[PDB]
Amino acid sequence: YNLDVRGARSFSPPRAGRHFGYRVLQVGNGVIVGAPGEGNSTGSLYQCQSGTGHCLPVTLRGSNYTSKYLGMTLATDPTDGSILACDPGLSRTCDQNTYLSGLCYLFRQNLQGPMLQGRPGFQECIKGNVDLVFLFDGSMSLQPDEFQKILDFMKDVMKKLSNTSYQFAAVQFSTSYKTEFDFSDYVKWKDPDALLKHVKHMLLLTNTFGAINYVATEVFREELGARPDATKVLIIITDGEATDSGNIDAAKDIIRYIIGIGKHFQTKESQETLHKFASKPASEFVKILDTFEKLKDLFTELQKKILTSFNMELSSSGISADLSRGHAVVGAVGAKDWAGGFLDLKADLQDDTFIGNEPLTPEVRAGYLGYTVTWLPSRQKTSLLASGAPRYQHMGRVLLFQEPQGGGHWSQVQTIHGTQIGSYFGGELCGVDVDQDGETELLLIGAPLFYGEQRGGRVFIYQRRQLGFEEVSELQGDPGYPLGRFGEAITALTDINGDGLVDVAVGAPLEEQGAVYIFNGRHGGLSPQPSQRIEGTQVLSGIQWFGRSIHGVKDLEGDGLADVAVGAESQMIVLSSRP
Amino acid sequence: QECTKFKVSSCRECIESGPGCTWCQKLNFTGPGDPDSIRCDTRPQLLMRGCAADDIMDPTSLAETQEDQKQLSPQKVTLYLRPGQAAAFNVTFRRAKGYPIDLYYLMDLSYSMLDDLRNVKKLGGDLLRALNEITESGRIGFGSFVDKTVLPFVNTHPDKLRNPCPNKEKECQPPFAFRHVLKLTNNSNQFQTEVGKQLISGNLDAPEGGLDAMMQVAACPEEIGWRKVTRLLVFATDDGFHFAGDGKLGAILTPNDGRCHLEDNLYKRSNEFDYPSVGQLAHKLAENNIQPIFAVTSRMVKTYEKLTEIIPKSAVGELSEDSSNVVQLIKNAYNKLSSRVFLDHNALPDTLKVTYDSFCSNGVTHRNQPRGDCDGVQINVPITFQVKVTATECIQEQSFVIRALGFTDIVTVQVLPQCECRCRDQSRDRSLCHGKGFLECGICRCDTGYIGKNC
Ligand SMILES: *[C@@H]1O[C@H](CO)[C@@H](O)[C@H](O)[C@H]1NC(C)=O
Ligand SMILES: *[C@@H]1O[C@H](CO)[C@@H](O)[C@H](O)[C@H]1NC(C)=O
Ligand SMILES: *[C@@H]1O[C@H](CO)[C@@H](O)[C@H](O)[C@H]1NC(C)=O
Ligand SMILES: [Ca+2]
Ligand SMILES: [Ca+2]
Ligand SMILES: [Ca+2]
Ligand SMILES: [Ca+2]
Ligand SMILES: [Ca+2]
Ligand SMILES: [Mg+2]
């Protein structure tokens, strides 16, 4: 109720697009603004300083690539100040298909400092024609029965993939390397039993680096039957760590799976020594088998996994993200024919874990799960992740996931269904810890397109009970804007009126020129009625979409007053809480 | 039954002070030590003070109607609203002879509609025949849609922008958002020739952009060529639909602006604006009086039936896998739309509350509802809606309209406050207040000049 509209400040670069202000974030050292590009323009991230009053675009130092999407997805970690930014517009073609996924960036210090990058849920292109090389271990450690089952594995893979466009080659490696048959040899016979008839166990060391280089330079050759327009694939089978060192830069263009088998890969430290030989992410290209017998189980993953139906080709990863306590998650709405899901990210961004609906039914498809992803952390109770599928059954729903506990796995603990078609229920989420006790007891769900009773958009308050989240109340915006999109932006604001209770802002960007509502924290929950309604008209005469984005966790200049940044069309605005 | 006073100094200030306040208009009603505040109180309290029933001023809400071809009557109503007291009047609905019908056929042209397209191309005469079997002087139009032409709604690979259909198919056109094909006409041969030119198409993701096309149909009445008659918009599809928010996947962040963007009969700028919201389309359709008929296949029926909650004048019918039953669908949908009658009003200030009582001919009655609703309405069999209007303040002169949804006929409701006692003629009491001041409501309001009380 104490936000000073008469002192509001405006920030806008002279060439800001209309979507400058699509995302705003107060970080330690200023305010970040996401500015997706319109039309042909690429997107960008801006750095805005309160003392300067200017907004300057940021240059990313290691990004080969920038699409119009950049600026669409911004998150910050309250514990350590990290910044997560994603570009969900990494487009690429594979034969006549086009793939679309994201490119995510992690800034430990600030936008100007060191940056990590990765490609979550990135499905590599594998064309219709595939030249695949089996690079199989023949080291001193293998028993004759174990060597045979590696050979049986290669034969069974070729048996399943006979009568495809696949062409095959095989190289044994130990101390040295020997091509057991070339691509042209496979073309001549197509008989796995005859092609591997002369194989003799080398029974020496394990020189994986030299072997992989030998494949890239001595095996993938046109005069040996290799097709220059085929996708190069390499399957590496080993039962121990490499006895050499170096680099496999020569084989970087080759898609590399590696299969680690047996007792020598018992500790996960030794399993990670295989990651440098395989493609990314390791969760897809590194298979650890505890026994050679599980090689027969593998034909489902290394044959069926190598368009009317889509898995991750159009995942649209990075379309939403959150970052809390060093843990990053990005949504992937296109996953599984737009059924959706999210990607649990390893914090160097080089590996990921997909989590979606289960079971996959016809009903969840085109639901856009992962359109929002919001951590609901707790110190004593289990920590959860809320993710919206605002298109589920054309109505929308929210799934609640529980963090892996102990040795176990991600678990889905609750589903919350919307009731109105087109309402985009679950299109905006927000966790609130009112008393700042470390337990996130409230989940706010926005339904910004909700229609009826002379007010557009809804925000529902859910509170965590023993069995799950129970709907306790609703944040009540004004009537009079049936299309106003109340709830397009929801955020916890820390304490702006000094009573120790977190407060919440809700943005309604299409209520005339846009508006922001303040709901104060009380003992037991949130006040359903707002204590303040800031009209965009009052902030700027010609403003539009005021309230499209809100972030107010910070005191930007250290004067004792809370600051709240608000996005609008081509604008970012800073409001200060005043006594 | 209750009258909190603050500083009443005349009759109007008394009535305005509260719904239960009344005023005594008797001469010499006040004692010298007592102010003129005591003329204002509840009715029993004023009677206790000796005021005769005929001197108690208690304005009550009132409804006056001017009637003047019987579908919606009356056409003009005047309301005098005492705060807290509702005024009632009945609107009579007499379903008239059906008007001519403009039917715009908006068809999905995704590849699974290939056999549907082969049938619809030959149904121009069957459609006009059906319209002239319901009423007379029918017209038909045609448009087509697929989706927005950006990733991931279509595959933007140049080979697939050229042939979105399967590679074997080669009577296929590039994907497109909306194409207006045929302006409304009674010439079935124009339909046959113009719809005959249309080729099947394709796209990438299952939901489609038909809501975009519906918005353009509603925003471009001159290009569509609507008459001022019954406007039916058939929406034939075998899939779900995108709506606002979905554009983010293709980096489309600008809301649908509800404007007409037809250039060369194509929604060219469709990749610039996000899909509309359902409520936004429901609003555009009600403005232009366009009633949609969702002709969808079996697995989509229950999904599209939920739209009838947001779009009051819409209907859903199950469409065949080859669209061969679409004519009966339209006939059944017209009966569904015309046997259901909603009575509703336009936007109101927060000072007015309107509620409806529905006295339907099919034996159903609803009381005190936000909207009039009757089903099974039959030609020339009248139904009644009782409208109750309540004001919370003493309001400024104002008006709103009442429609039977789906028709342009209105009831213009003129709303006036009633904060004025209409008091007795000062005749027979002239000689007045022993001064020049004039009387209003038995209390002397003296001409300024010395002023005071008794004058
Ligand atoms: C960009 O390309 C360079 C190759 O020069 C590579 O080092 C870098 O990892 C690439 N970045 C991404 C995100 O792939
Ligand atoms: C119509 O309104 C009148 C008052 O004008 C009332 O007597 C009557 O009850 C209403 N109609 C019905 C069916 O009750
Ligand atoms: C068809 O309708 C048009 C209205 O544009 C009218 O000019 C024409 O005379 C009609 N033709 C027939 C045969 O009814
Ligand atoms: Ca708490
Ligand atoms: Ca507070
Ligand atoms: Ca400050
Ligand atoms: Ca069909
Ligand atoms: Ca589509
Ligand atoms: Mg070994």
mmCIF file of N, CA and C in Angstrom, chain A residues 261-346:
data_model
loop_
_atom_site.group_PDB
_atom_site.id
_atom_site.type_symbol
_atom_site.label_atom_id
_atom_site.label_comp_id
_atom_site.label_asym_id
_atom_site.label_seq_id
_atom_site.Cartn_x
_atom_site.Cartn_y
_atom_site.Cartn_z
ATOM 1 N N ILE A 261 30.730 -51.638 -18.931
ATOM 2 C CA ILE A 261 30.204 -52.929 -18.503
ATOM 3 C C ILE A 261 31.039 -53.477 -17.351
ATOM 4 N N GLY A 262 30.373 -53.858 -16.267
ATOM 5 C CA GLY A 262 30.953 -54.759 -15.292
ATOM 6 C C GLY A 262 31.534 -54.100 -14.055
ATOM 7 N N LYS A 263 32.345 -54.899 -13.351
ATOM 8 C CA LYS A 263 32.830 -54.540 -12.020
ATOM 9 C C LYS A 263 33.738 -53.317 -12.030
ATOM 10 N N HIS A 264 34.437 -53.050 -13.138
ATOM 11 C CA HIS A 264 35.375 -51.932 -13.127
ATOM 12 C C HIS A 264 34.686 -50.583 -13.224
ATOM 13 N N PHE A 265 33.380 -50.562 -13.485
ATOM 14 C CA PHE A 265 32.583 -49.342 -13.484
ATOM 15 C C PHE A 265 31.586 -49.353 -12.330
ATOM 16 N N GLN A 266 32.032 -49.835 -11.170
ATOM 17 C CA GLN A 266 31.153 -49.975 -10.013
ATOM 18 C C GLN A 266 30.985 -48.653 -9.275
ATOM 19 N N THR A 267 32.067 -47.898 -9.126
ATOM 20 C CA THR A 267 32.002 -46.572 -8.536
ATOM 21 C C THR A 267 31.630 -45.561 -9.606
ATOM 22 N N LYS A 268 30.782 -44.604 -9.232
ATOM 23 C CA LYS A 268 30.362 -43.594 -10.193
ATOM 24 C C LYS A 268 31.503 -42.663 -10.583
ATOM 25 N N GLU A 269 32.587 -42.635 -9.803
ATOM 26 C CA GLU A 269 33.758 -41.861 -10.201
ATOM 27 C C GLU A 269 34.386 -42.437 -11.464
ATOM 28 N N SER A 270 34.460 -43.766 -11.557
ATOM 29 C CA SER A 270 35.000 -44.394 -12.756
ATOM 30 C C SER A 270 34.026 -44.302 -13.920
ATOM 31 N N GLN A 271 32.722 -44.296 -13.633
ATOM 32 C CA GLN A 271 31.725 -44.143 -14.689
ATOM 33 C C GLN A 271 31.842 -42.784 -15.365
ATOM 34 N N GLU A 272 32.127 -41.738 -14.589
ATOM 35 C CA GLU A 272 32.268 -40.407 -15.162
ATOM 36 C C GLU A 272 33.518 -40.274 -16.027
ATOM 37 N N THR A 273 34.493 -41.176 -15.889
ATOM 38 C CA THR A 273 35.640 -41.132 -16.789
ATOM 39 C C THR A 273 35.274 -41.502 -18.217
ATOM 40 N N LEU A 274 34.082 -42.047 -18.441
ATOM 41 C CA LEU A 274 33.621 -42.379 -19.780
ATOM 42 C C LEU A 274 32.892 -41.225 -20.454
ATOM 43 N N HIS A 275 32.525 -40.187 -19.702
ATOM 44 C CA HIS A 275 31.760 -39.084 -20.275
ATOM 45 C C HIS A 275 32.562 -38.341 -21.340
ATOM 46 N N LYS A 276 33.864 -38.158 -21.121
ATOM 47 C CA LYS A 276 34.670 -37.431 -22.093
ATOM 48 C C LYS A 276 34.764 -38.131 -23.445
ATOM 49 N N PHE A 277 34.452 -39.424 -23.519
ATOM 50 C CA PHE A 277 34.466 -40.135 -24.794
ATOM 51 C C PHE A 277 33.136 -40.072 -25.541
ATOM 52 N N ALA A 278 32.032 -39.787 -24.853
ATOM 53 C CA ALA A 278 30.702 -39.853 -25.443
ATOM 54 C C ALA A 278 30.169 -38.464 -25.783
ATOM 55 N N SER A 279 29.090 -38.445 -26.564
ATOM 56 C CA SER A 279 28.387 -37.203 -26.849
ATOM 57 C C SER A 279 27.692 -36.685 -25.589
ATOM 58 N N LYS A 280 26.951 -35.592 -25.748
ATOM 59 C CA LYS A 280 26.204 -35.005 -24.640
ATOM 60 C C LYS A 280 24.700 -34.970 -24.900
ATOM 61 N N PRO A 281 23.905 -35.194 -23.848
ATOM 62 C CA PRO A 281 24.368 -35.375 -22.473
ATOM 63 C C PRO A 281 24.701 -36.822 -22.121
ATOM 64 N N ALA A 282 25.493 -37.004 -21.055
ATOM 65 C CA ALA A 282 25.907 -38.343 -20.634
ATOM 66 C C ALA A 282 24.713 -39.236 -20.326
ATOM 67 N N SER A 283 23.608 -38.650 -19.852
ATOM 68 C CA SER A 283 22.418 -39.430 -19.526
ATOM 69 C C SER A 283 21.829 -40.123 -20.746
ATOM 70 N N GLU A 284 22.165 -39.666 -21.948
ATOM 71 C CA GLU A 284 21.727 -40.319 -23.170
ATOM 72 C C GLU A 284 22.806 -41.193 -23.788
ATOM 73 N N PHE A 285 24.066 -40.764 -23.738
ATOM 74 C CA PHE A 285 25.102 -41.434 -24.511
ATOM 75 C C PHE A 285 26.014 -42.339 -23.691
ATOM 76 N N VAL A 286 25.915 -42.334 -22.365
ATOM 77 C CA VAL A 286 26.742 -43.185 -21.515
ATOM 78 C C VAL A 286 25.829 -44.198 -20.836
ATOM 79 N N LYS A 287 26.007 -45.471 -21.181
ATOM 80 C CA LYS A 287 25.263 -46.572 -20.583
ATOM 81 C C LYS A 287 26.192 -47.360 -19.668
ATOM 82 N N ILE A 288 25.815 -47.481 -18.401
ATOM 83 C CA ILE A 288 26.571 -48.267 -17.433
ATOM 84 C C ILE A 288 25.793 -49.545 -17.149
ATOM 85 N N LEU A 289 26.411 -50.686 -17.436
ATOM 86 C CA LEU A 289 25.813 -51.991 -17.194
ATOM 87 C C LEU A 289 26.595 -52.694 -16.096
ATOM 88 N N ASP A 290 25.877 -53.244 -15.116
ATOM 89 C CA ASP A 290 26.555 -53.927 -14.023
ATOM 90 C C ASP A 290 26.987 -55.328 -14.430
ATOM 91 N N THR A 291 26.323 -55.909 -15.430
ATOM 92 C CA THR A 291 26.642 -57.237 -15.931
ATOM 93 C C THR A 291 26.608 -57.237 -17.454
ATOM 94 N N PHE A 292 27.397 -58.135 -18.048
ATOM 95 C CA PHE A 292 27.363 -58.326 -19.493
ATOM 96 C C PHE A 292 26.017 -58.857 -19.965
ATOM 97 N N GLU A 293 25.258 -59.498 -19.082
ATOM 98 C CA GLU A 293 23.980 -60.066 -19.492
ATOM 99 C C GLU A 293 22.978 -58.978 -19.847
ATOM 100 N N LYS A 294 23.109 -57.801 -19.240
ATOM 101 C CA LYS A 294 22.215 -56.700 -19.564
ATOM 102 C C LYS A 294 22.477 -56.095 -20.941
ATOM 103 N N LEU A 295 23.489 -56.574 -21.674
ATOM 104 C CA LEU A 295 23.673 -56.143 -23.057
ATOM 105 C C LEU A 295 22.484 -56.534 -23.920
ATOM 106 N N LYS A 296 21.869 -57.683 -23.626
ATOM 107 C CA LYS A 296 20.689 -58.106 -24.370
ATOM 108 C C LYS A 296 19.491 -57.215 -24.069
ATOM 109 N N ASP A 297 19.415 -56.662 -22.855
ATOM 110 C CA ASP A 297 18.382 -55.679 -22.553
ATOM 111 C C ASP A 297 18.568 -54.393 -23.345
ATOM 112 N N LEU A 298 19.783 -54.129 -23.832
ATOM 113 C CA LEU A 298 20.118 -52.815 -24.374
ATOM 114 C C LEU A 298 19.497 -52.543 -25.732
ATOM 115 N N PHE A 299 19.118 -53.583 -26.479
ATOM 116 C CA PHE A 299 18.636 -53.381 -27.844
ATOM 117 C C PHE A 299 17.456 -52.422 -27.900
ATOM 118 N N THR A 300 16.736 -52.249 -26.792
ATOM 119 C CA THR A 300 15.647 -51.279 -26.772
ATOM 120 C C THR A 300 16.180 -49.852 -26.821
ATOM 121 N N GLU A 301 17.258 -49.570 -26.094
ATOM 122 C CA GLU A 301 17.786 -48.212 -26.095
ATOM 123 C C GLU A 301 18.737 -47.947 -27.258
ATOM 124 N N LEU A 302 19.633 -48.868 -27.599
ATOM 125 C CA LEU A 302 20.607 -48.511 -28.623
ATOM 126 C C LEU A 302 20.182 -48.932 -30.019
ATOM 127 N N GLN A 303 18.971 -49.455 -30.176
ATOM 128 C CA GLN A 303 18.423 -49.712 -31.500
ATOM 129 C C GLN A 303 17.104 -48.991 -31.716
ATOM 130 N N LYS A 304 16.166 -49.099 -30.776
ATOM 131 C CA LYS A 304 14.903 -48.390 -30.931
ATOM 132 C C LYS A 304 15.066 -46.882 -30.742
ATOM 133 N N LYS A 305 16.067 -46.440 -29.969
ATOM 134 C CA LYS A 305 16.237 -44.998 -29.790
ATOM 135 C C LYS A 305 17.061 -44.360 -30.898
ATOM 136 N N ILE A 306 17.955 -45.107 -31.543
ATOM 137 C CA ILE A 306 18.622 -44.573 -32.722
ATOM 138 C C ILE A 306 17.620 -44.644 -33.868
ATOM 139 N N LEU A 307 8.091 -36.836 -39.839
ATOM 140 C CA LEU A 307 7.766 -37.260 -38.483
ATOM 141 C C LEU A 307 6.335 -36.890 -38.104
ATOM 142 N N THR A 308 5.571 -37.887 -37.653
ATOM 143 C CA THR A 308 4.250 -37.665 -37.074
ATOM 144 C C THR A 308 4.276 -37.617 -35.549
ATOM 145 N N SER A 309 5.216 -38.319 -34.917
ATOM 146 C CA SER A 309 5.382 -38.331 -33.471
ATOM 147 C C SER A 309 6.751 -37.772 -33.108
ATOM 148 N N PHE A 310 6.790 -36.983 -32.042
ATOM 149 C CA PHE A 310 7.993 -36.272 -31.640
ATOM 150 C C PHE A 310 8.315 -36.554 -30.182
ATOM 151 N N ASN A 311 9.597 -36.790 -29.903
ATOM 152 C CA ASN A 311 10.042 -36.990 -28.531
ATOM 153 C C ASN A 311 10.643 -35.698 -27.984
ATOM 154 N N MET A 312 11.899 -35.400 -28.339
ATOM 155 C CA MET A 312 12.566 -34.177 -27.906
ATOM 156 C C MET A 312 13.031 -33.297 -29.060
ATOM 157 N N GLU A 313 12.748 -33.684 -30.308
ATOM 158 C CA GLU A 313 13.151 -32.888 -31.465
ATOM 159 C C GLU A 313 12.595 -31.471 -31.405
ATOM 160 N N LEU A 314 11.377 -31.310 -30.899
ATOM 161 C CA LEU A 314 10.728 -30.014 -30.762
ATOM 162 C C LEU A 314 10.436 -29.719 -29.297
ATOM 163 N N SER A 315 11.386 -30.038 -28.419
ATOM 164 C CA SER A 315 11.129 -29.940 -26.986
ATOM 165 C C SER A 315 10.859 -28.507 -26.532
ATOM 166 N N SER A 316 11.394 -27.515 -27.249
ATOM 167 C CA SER A 316 11.321 -26.113 -26.829
ATOM 168 C C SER A 316 11.853 -25.921 -25.410
ATOM 169 N N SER A 317 12.920 -26.641 -25.067
ATOM 170 C CA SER A 317 13.513 -26.492 -23.745
ATOM 171 C C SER A 317 13.955 -25.052 -23.508
ATOM 172 N N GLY A 318 13.932 -24.644 -22.243
ATOM 173 C CA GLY A 318 14.279 -23.292 -21.872
ATOM 174 C C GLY A 318 13.161 -22.290 -22.027
ATOM 175 N N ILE A 319 11.953 -22.737 -22.372
ATOM 176 C CA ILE A 319 10.838 -21.812 -22.496
ATOM 177 C C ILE A 319 10.412 -21.274 -21.134
ATOM 178 N N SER A 320 10.850 -21.920 -20.058
ATOM 179 C CA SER A 320 10.620 -21.477 -18.696
ATOM 180 C C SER A 320 11.745 -22.050 -17.850
ATOM 181 N N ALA A 321 12.049 -21.387 -16.741
ATOM 182 C CA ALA A 321 13.150 -21.862 -15.919
ATOM 183 C C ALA A 321 13.007 -21.325 -14.507
ATOM 184 N N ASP A 322 13.642 -22.027 -13.571
ATOM 185 C CA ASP A 322 13.781 -21.554 -12.204
ATOM 186 C C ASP A 322 15.130 -22.024 -11.684
ATOM 187 N N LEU A 323 15.619 -21.330 -10.663
ATOM 188 C CA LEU A 323 16.950 -21.589 -10.127
ATOM 189 C C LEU A 323 16.905 -21.306 -8.636
ATOM 190 N N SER A 324 17.134 -22.338 -7.827
ATOM 191 C CA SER A 324 17.032 -22.222 -6.380
ATOM 192 C C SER A 324 18.034 -23.158 -5.729
ATOM 193 N N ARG A 325 18.794 -22.628 -4.766
ATOM 194 C CA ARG A 325 19.780 -23.403 -4.009
ATOM 195 C C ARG A 325 20.726 -24.176 -4.926
ATOM 196 N N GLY A 326 21.193 -23.514 -5.984
ATOM 197 C CA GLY A 326 22.142 -24.132 -6.886
ATOM 198 C C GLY A 326 21.554 -25.142 -7.840
ATOM 199 N N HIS A 327 20.236 -25.301 -7.861
ATOM 200 C CA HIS A 327 19.582 -26.301 -8.692
ATOM 201 C C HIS A 327 18.742 -25.601 -9.752
ATOM 202 N N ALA A 328 18.962 -25.975 -11.011
ATOM 203 C CA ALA A 328 18.319 -25.356 -12.161
ATOM 204 C C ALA A 328 17.359 -26.332 -12.828
ATOM 205 N N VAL A 329 16.210 -25.812 -13.256
ATOM 206 C CA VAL A 329 15.208 -26.577 -13.990
ATOM 207 C C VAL A 329 14.710 -25.718 -15.140
ATOM 208 N N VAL A 330 14.554 -26.328 -16.306
ATOM 209 C CA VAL A 330 13.998 -25.656 -17.472
ATOM 210 C C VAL A 330 12.811 -26.472 -17.961
ATOM 211 N N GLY A 331 11.742 -25.781 -18.342
ATOM 212 C CA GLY A 331 10.608 -26.454 -18.931
ATOM 213 C C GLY A 331 10.876 -26.878 -20.361
ATOM 214 N N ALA A 332 10.112 -27.877 -20.812
ATOM 215 C CA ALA A 332 10.255 -28.433 -22.159
ATOM 216 C C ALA A 332 8.852 -28.788 -22.662
ATOM 217 N N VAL A 333 8.125 -27.766 -23.128
ATOM 218 C CA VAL A 333 6.704 -27.909 -23.433
ATOM 219 C C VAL A 333 6.468 -28.834 -24.620
ATOM 220 N N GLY A 334 7.377 -28.853 -25.595
ATOM 221 C CA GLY A 334 7.161 -29.674 -26.769
ATOM 222 C C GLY A 334 7.411 -31.155 -26.581
ATOM 223 N N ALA A 335 7.967 -31.545 -25.439
ATOM 224 C CA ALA A 335 8.350 -32.931 -25.222
ATOM 225 C C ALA A 335 7.156 -33.863 -25.381
ATOM 226 N N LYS A 336 7.384 -34.988 -26.059
ATOM 227 C CA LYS A 336 6.381 -36.048 -26.182
ATOM 228 C C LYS A 336 5.096 -35.532 -26.830
ATOM 229 N N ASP A 337 5.246 -35.018 -28.050
ATOM 230 C CA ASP A 337 4.134 -34.425 -28.799
ATOM 231 C C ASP A 337 3.437 -33.347 -27.967
ATOM 232 N N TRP A 338 4.251 -32.438 -27.431
ATOM 233 C CA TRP A 338 3.791 -31.282 -26.670
ATOM 234 C C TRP A 338 3.020 -31.680 -25.421
ATOM 235 N N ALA A 339 3.179 -32.931 -24.992
ATOM 236 C CA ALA A 339 2.717 -33.307 -23.668
ATOM 237 C C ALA A 339 3.454 -32.504 -22.612
ATOM 238 N N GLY A 340 4.761 -32.366 -22.770
ATOM 239 C CA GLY A 340 5.544 -31.492 -21.928
ATOM 240 C C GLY A 340 6.305 -32.226 -20.842
ATOM 241 N N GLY A 341 6.918 -31.425 -19.987
ATOM 242 C CA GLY A 341 7.775 -31.908 -18.924
ATOM 243 C C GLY A 341 8.848 -30.876 -18.643
ATOM 244 N N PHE A 342 9.769 -31.244 -17.754
ATOM 245 C CA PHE A 342 10.883 -30.369 -17.417
ATOM 246 C C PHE A 342 12.179 -31.169 -17.408
ATOM 247 N N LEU A 343 13.287 -30.444 -17.305
ATOM 248 C CA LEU A 343 14.622 -31.022 -17.398
ATOM 249 C C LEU A 343 15.387 -30.658 -16.133
ATOM 250 N N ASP A 344 15.630 -31.659 -15.294
ATOM 251 C CA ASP A 344 16.502 -31.509 -14.142
ATOM 252 C C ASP A 344 17.935 -31.350 -14.629
ATOM 253 N N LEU A 345 18.530 -30.187 -14.387
ATOM 254 C CA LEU A 345 19.824 -29.844 -14.967
ATOM 255 C C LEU A 345 20.953 -30.057 -13.966
ATOM 256 N N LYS A 346 21.975 -30.795 -14.386
ATOM 257 C CA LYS A 346 23.240 -30.770 -13.669
ATOM 258 C C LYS A 346 23.837 -29.371 -13.783
#
